[PDB]
């Protein structure tokens, strides 16, 4: 179960879609949240320049500072994904 | 509750301040987002921006931090990730 639901975004629509597609691939490949996060972060550093940060989990709160137009927070199934650029 | 430092690239005094700050946050708030916000805001004020904080019982992370500005620790079963980047 990997249905995507965007909770909050400051990001272009096409980059949002790419984030979802990237996370979907990550979850196909990796079982562990850290490794899912790592895949997504590394792909975003490569495609959209450093420095990205990714949190993947079922129970967490955050408070972060992001660069304009580079923040997304979404669910794939029951797993929440926070992805943002800072640095 | 019981503080257990799992990872740290951070001075001894700053580690202790992170723990102290989180302990105060957990006294004041129940909501993870609000605990995180308190810790982030205090660290930005005391040690300059830009910090980021995650508080939760179930998550994995992959982040990039500035040298000497990363800590990952538990208070009880709640994990706290606190780092600078930017």
């Amino acid at each position: 179960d990997r249905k995507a639901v965007i909770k909050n975004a400051d990001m272009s629509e096409d980059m949002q879609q790419d984030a979802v597609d990237c996370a979907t691939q990550a979850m196909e490949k990796y079982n562990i949240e850290k490794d899912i996060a790592a895949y997504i972060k590394k792909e975003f550093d490569k495609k959209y320049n450093p420095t990205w940060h990714c949190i993947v989990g079922r129970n967490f709160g955050s408070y972060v500072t992001h660069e304009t137009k580079h923040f997304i927070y979404f669910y794939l199934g029951q797993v929440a994904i926070l992805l943002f650029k800072s640095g | 509750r019981k503080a257990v430092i799992k990872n740290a690239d951070m001075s001894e005094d700053m580690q202790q301040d992170a723990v102290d700050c989180a302990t105060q946050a957990m006294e004041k708030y129940n909501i993870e987002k609000d605990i995180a916000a308190y810790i982030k805001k205090e660290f930005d004020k005391k040690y300059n921006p830009t910090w980021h904080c995650i508080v939760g019982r179930n998550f994995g992370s992959y982040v990039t931090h500035e040298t000497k500005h990363f800590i990952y620790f538990y208070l009880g079963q709640v994990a706290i990730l606190l780092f600078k980047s930017g």
Binding site: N8, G57, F60, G61 | -
Partner: peptide, 7 residues
Amino acid sequence: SRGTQTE
């Protein structure tokens, strides 16, 4: 600056 909270 902004925050998130899981359901």
